[PDB]
Design a protein around this ligand. Structure first.
Ligand code: MG
Ligand code: MG
Ligand code: MG
Ligand code: MG
Ligand code: MG
Ligand code: MG
Ligand code: MG
Ligand code: MG
Ligand code: MG
Ligand code: MG
Ligand code: MG
Ligand code: MG
Ligand code: MG
Ligand code: MG
Ligand code: MG
Ligand code: MG
Ligand code: MG
Ligand code: MG
Ligand code: MG
Ligand code: MG
Ligand code: MG
Ligand code: MG
Ligand code: MG
Ligand code: MG
Ligand code: MG
Ligand code: MG
Ligand code: MG
Ligand code: MG
Ligand code: MG
Ligand code: MG
Ligand code: MG
Ligand code: MG
Ligand code: MG
Ligand code: MG
Ligand code: MG
Ligand code: MG
Ligand code: MG
Ligand code: MG
Ligand code: MG
Ligand code: MG
Ligand code: MG
Ligand code: MG
Ligand code: MG
Ligand code: MG
Ligand code: MG
Ligand code: MG
Ligand code: MG
Ligand code: MG
Ligand code: MG
Ligand code: MG
Ligand code: MG
Ligand code: MG
Ligand code: MG
Ligand code: MG
Ligand code: MG
Ligand code: MG
Ligand code: MG
Ligand code: MG
Ligand code: MG
Ligand code: MG
Ligand code: MG
Ligand code: MG
Ligand code: MG
Ligand code: MG
Ligand code: MG
Ligand code: MG
Ligand code: MG
Ligand code: MG
Ligand code: MG
Ligand code: MG
Ligand code: MG
Ligand code: MG
Ligand code: MG
Ligand code: MG
Ligand code: MG
Ligand code: MG
Ligand code: MG
Ligand code: MG
Ligand code: MG
Lengths: 68, 100, 114, 275, 88
RNA sequence: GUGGGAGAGGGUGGUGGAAUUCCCGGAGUAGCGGUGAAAUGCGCAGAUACCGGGAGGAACGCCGAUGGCGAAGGCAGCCACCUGGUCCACCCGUGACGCUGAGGCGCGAAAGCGUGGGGAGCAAACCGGAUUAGAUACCCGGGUAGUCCACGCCCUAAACGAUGCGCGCUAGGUCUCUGGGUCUCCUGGGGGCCGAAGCUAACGCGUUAAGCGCGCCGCCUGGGGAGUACGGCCGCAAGG
């Protein structure tokens, strides 16, 4: 169920792309590992390094509670 | 001159009039600093991932610009001066990096 | 008297504290390992935590509570047993969520956590 | 900066002097000075009522503007920065476009040749004056009034600054130079920025004579006196205090609080100071 | 940074023959350019020790060429360092 | 030179949230805390646990990696400015301009020192409680320097790869990071593992040599006494 597949063309720099990006954050809000996002080394850097921005502007969470 | 993307969030709970005023302060400020507006996109409110100034929602702005390198810092300071502006974040505009 | 509320379980290595509150977040009653009659190390055991959550809910059901949402903090032994106790208590347990504090590398810990 | 001397005399070895770099005018503006009545620390009865005062340099008193809401909306240029013997801080000569001239105490960062203005509408930049309510919460400020139109009373000494903390109805919340947390009325004017000459405290007077120039005569210890003169008086040889350390007048002098408890301004002080 | 344009003028005013990039002349001149800017950068940023090494390398670099240039044509050596204002 | 690239490389200025602490309002009751078990301690003068408000400082969770960068020490939220090294492709420019390096000069973790700030957490010294024959310790409750910021000192280390720099030559397999191509794969440059030949007292090294060779430098000459003494230079002192 690797996330990269379940999406088409996307830009790893558009930090306002909240709807797309919000998949790359686990159920608990944490940035997902390369073993789940399917991104290569080089790409996961741009992925994270933008996700952080999107949090700052208020569009992504820093953390979430965990419901069972 | 270089290309940047001014992002700004405002007090969501204003009237439409005062809202324009802050933009009037903003727009006059951009001009005072030699900013040149290119694209510009105004999405307004958006449900926030977390409260900013204890407020679940917030009004957005955004303008791609062209202005001098040395002046962006001094501008953001001036951009942040109003008690209603709540976040400013100028990012160097860079070409899209694509997957798939 | 209130219908719905919340249950807070502070479950640590040394003790398990259970507090039931109202909707706005105000405590109604509390109980814990000490309250039910243990001292020392016994305060923290799962059986101890059980008596706590039960006595806590017993006290809470006295004032009219029926349905709560359970809030969990801490990686205690008597955490999971306390969770049991509340569901089996006579209460409705609408939902269970873990809001344990985790720092993003903040204050230097005591030497025992290094 | 602070200027040292080579140890060519025993007293020069430690003595340090102010750097005076910010000064551009070595003469006070005549139409703003008046003579200082030296008192020697003696009152209208002629009695010393503040011991050990007198014999310092002569001084011309510079008339300072501690109001500023006096001239709202009229800007002024900073013509010079001058030495004022009556304070720690430096002073700024303003030429109003009004033509009128005034002094204010000089903030840090002020430039010779820049402009400043006072009022509800002033930009929040160094040297401007506004009622406290219109200064953004968190910016540091000086020359603060204590009650509206009563004059700037707080943060006036070199290097000092007060800082706005938050608001509560008609009142704003200041952290004073001492760290005390106080409510001040929002109509109290204040000037954005801190006072300059912050290097002031690092000045080493250097010898007895310097203090003398400052009009400060020698202070004699209680322990060096006789019982008639002082609680610590007398004893054969040196002596410890032998009672709680006391003033010449007998009150306890290590620790004992003296603020009047029932003082009406108590409703306005949130937290007494620190350190 | 230094810009493309700003740099060309240097390349253009020092080239030995019409097409020249990177003769000792141009080489030194290009180096003298980044040196004098870094010097001014360190004048403000006194705590940028890492970039000082860069400077010391460039200063070192320009030095070794000047020795080369001064060795082959002395007349030409003194000519370049006058237009660049260099000795001390 | 031209054209591109990756990066916690360095300096300045800002700014985001998580958490700890203290303060304030609420609501609430008989315990909380801590250990192997305990005590000290805190708590009806209302603690803990929970909700709201506020203050301040320090460090940046997930990403994060057997990863990246730097000459070394070392460098990790994010944003802008200023700046260094370095790789790649084109094969365009100069024409041996190179290598090394006694002295010199600069950089240099922590602790430490000077003047001034700052001080939430942590914590030498110190106090108290336990343990014990004793416990000037290990464990628990407190706690000051300091840890943070600016400027100026100190210059040490298991400052390590215990491996000086540069160049050339001597099988390959595989994993990874980062450029470029004719994108199976080929070619460069870094980071690991196993291995040809060879080296090694052995362990192990092996195109990142500890192999075969050249250049220049630093260093060793039985253990202790001793990194001591004396002299000398450096430092505020510690001390180098
Ligand atoms: Mg604001
Ligand atoms: Mg316990
Ligand atoms: Mg402690
Ligand atoms: Mg000065
Ligand atoms: Mg001196
Ligand atoms: Mg002198
Ligand atoms: Mg001198
Ligand atoms: Mg003498
Ligand atoms: Mg002397
Ligand atoms: Mg002075
Ligand atoms: Mg002086
Ligand atoms: Mg001065
Ligand atoms: Mg007169
Ligand atoms: Mg007078
Ligand atoms: Mg009289
Ligand atoms: Mg009389
Ligand atoms: Mg007196
Ligand atoms: Mg007197
Ligand atoms: Mg003065
Ligand atoms: Mg002094
Ligand atoms: Mg005097
Ligand atoms: Mg005195
Ligand atoms: Mg005396
Ligand atoms: Mg005496
Ligand atoms: Mg006597
Ligand atoms: Mg008498
Ligand atoms: Mg008497
Ligand atoms: Mg007496
Ligand atoms: Mg006596
Ligand atoms: Mg006598
Ligand atoms: Mg005596
Ligand atoms: Mg006698
Ligand atoms: Mg005597
Ligand atoms: Mg005696
Ligand atoms: Mg005596
Ligand atoms: Mg004596
Ligand atoms: Mg006596
Ligand atoms: Mg005494
Ligand atoms: Mg006595
Ligand atoms: Mg006595
Ligand atoms: Mg008053
Ligand atoms: Mg170079
Ligand atoms: Mg030369
Ligand atoms: Mg309370
Ligand atoms: Mg009572
Ligand atoms: Mg709270
Ligand atoms: Mg490297
Ligand atoms: Mg060629
Ligand atoms: Mg040397
Ligand atoms: Mg050091
Ligand atoms: Mg240190
Ligand atoms: Mg000491
Ligand atoms: Mg210190
Ligand atoms: Mg101090
Ligand atoms: Mg003890
Ligand atoms: Mg004992
Ligand atoms: Mg002890
Ligand atoms: Mg301890
Ligand atoms: Mg000290
Ligand atoms: Mg220290
Ligand atoms: Mg190592
Ligand atoms: Mg190495
Ligand atoms: Mg060694
Ligand atoms: Mg050895
Ligand atoms: Mg060497
Ligand atoms: Mg060798
Ligand atoms: Mg490749
Ligand atoms: Mg490629
Ligand atoms: Mg390789
Ligand atoms: Mg590595
Ligand atoms: Mg091997
Ligand atoms: Mg073999
Ligand atoms: Mg290989
Ligand atoms: Mg060997
Ligand atoms: Mg011998
Ligand atoms: Mg020997
Ligand atoms: Mg020695
Ligand atoms: Mg030693
Ligand atoms: Mg000696």
């Amino acid at each position: 169920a690797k996330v990269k597949a379940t999406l088409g063309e996307f830009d790893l720099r558009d930090y306002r792309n909240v709807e797309v990006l919000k998949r790359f954050l686990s159920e608990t809000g944490k940035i997902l590992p390369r073993r789940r996002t399917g991104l290569s080394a080089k790409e996961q850097r741009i992925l994270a390094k933008t996700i952080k921005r999107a949090r700052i502007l208020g569009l992504l969470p820093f953390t979430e509670k965990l419901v069972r | 001159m270089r290309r940047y993307e001014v992002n700004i969030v405002l007090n969501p709970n204003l009237d439409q009039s005062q809202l324009a005023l802050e933009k009037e302060i903003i727009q006059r400020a951009l001009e005072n600093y030699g900013a040149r507006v290119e694209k510009v996109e105004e999405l307004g409110l958006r449900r926030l991932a977390y409260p900013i100034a204890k407020d679940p929602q917030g009004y957005f702005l955004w303008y791609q610009v062209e202005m001098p390198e040395d002046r962006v810092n001094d501008l953001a300071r001036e951009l942040r001066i109003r008690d209603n502006v709540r976040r400013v974040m100028v990012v160097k505009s860079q070409e899209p990096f694509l997957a798939n | 008297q209130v219908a719905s509320g919340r249950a807070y379980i502070h479950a640590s290595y040394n003790n398990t504290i259970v507090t039931i509150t109202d909707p706005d977040g105000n405590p109604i009653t509390w109980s814990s390992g000490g309250v039910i009659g243990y001292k020392g190390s016994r305060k923290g055991t799962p059986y101890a935590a059980q008596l706590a959550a039960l006595d806590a809910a017993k006290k809470a059901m006295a004032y009219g509570m029926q349905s709560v949402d359970v809030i969990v903090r801490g990686t205690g032994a008597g955490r999971e047993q306390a969770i049991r106790a509340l569901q089996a208590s006579g209460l409705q347990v609408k939902s269970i969520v873990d809001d344990t504090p985790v720092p993003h590398n903040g204050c230097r810990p005591k030497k025992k956590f290094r | 900066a602070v200027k040292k001397f080579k140890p060519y005399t025993p007293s020069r070895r430690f003595m340090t002097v102010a750097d005076f770099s910010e000064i551009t005018k070595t003469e006070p503006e005549k139409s703003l000075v008046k003579p200082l009545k030296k008192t020697g620390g003696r009152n209208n009865q002629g009695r010393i009522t503040v011991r050990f005062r007198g014999g310092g340099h002569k001084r011309l008193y510079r008339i300072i503007d501690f109001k500023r809401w006096d001239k709202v909306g009229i800007p002024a240029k900073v013509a010079a920065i001058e030495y004022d013997p009556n304070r720690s801080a430096r002073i700024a000569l303003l030429h109003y476009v009004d033509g009128e001239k005034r002094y204010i105490i000089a903030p840090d960062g002020l430039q010779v040749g820049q402009q400043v203005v006072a009022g509800p509408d002033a930009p929040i930049q160094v040297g401007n004056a506004l009622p406290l309510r219109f200064i953004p919460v968190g910016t540091v400020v000086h020359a603060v009034e204590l009650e509206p139109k009563k004059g700037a009373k707080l943060a006036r000494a070199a290097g000092t600054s007060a800082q706005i903390q938050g608001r509560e109805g008609d009142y704003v919340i200041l952290r004073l130079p001492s760290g005390e947390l106080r409510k001040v009325h929002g109509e109290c004017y204040a000037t954005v920025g801190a006072v300059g000459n912050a290097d002031h405290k690092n000045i080493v007077l250097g010898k007895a004579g310097r203090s003398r120039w400052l009009g400060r005569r020698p202070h004699v210890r209680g322990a060096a006196m006789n019982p008639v003169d002082h609680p610590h008086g007398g004893g054969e040889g040196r002596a410890p205090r032998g009672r709680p350390p006391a003033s010449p007048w007998g009150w306890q002098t290590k620790g004992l609080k003296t603020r009047k408890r029932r003082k009406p301004s108590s409703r306005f002080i949130i937290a007494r100071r620190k350190k | 940074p230094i810009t493309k344009e700003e740099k060309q003028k240097v390349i253009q005013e020092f080239a030995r023959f019409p097409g020249d990039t990177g003769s000792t002349e141009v080489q030194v001149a290009l180096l003298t350019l980044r040196i004098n800017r870094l010097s001014e950068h360190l004048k403000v940023h006194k705590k940028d020790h890492h970039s000082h090494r860069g400077l010391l390398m460039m200063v070192g670099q320009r030095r070794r060429l000047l020795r080369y240039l001064q060795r082959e044509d002395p007349e030409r050596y003194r000519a370049l360092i006058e237009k660049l204002g260099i000795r001390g």
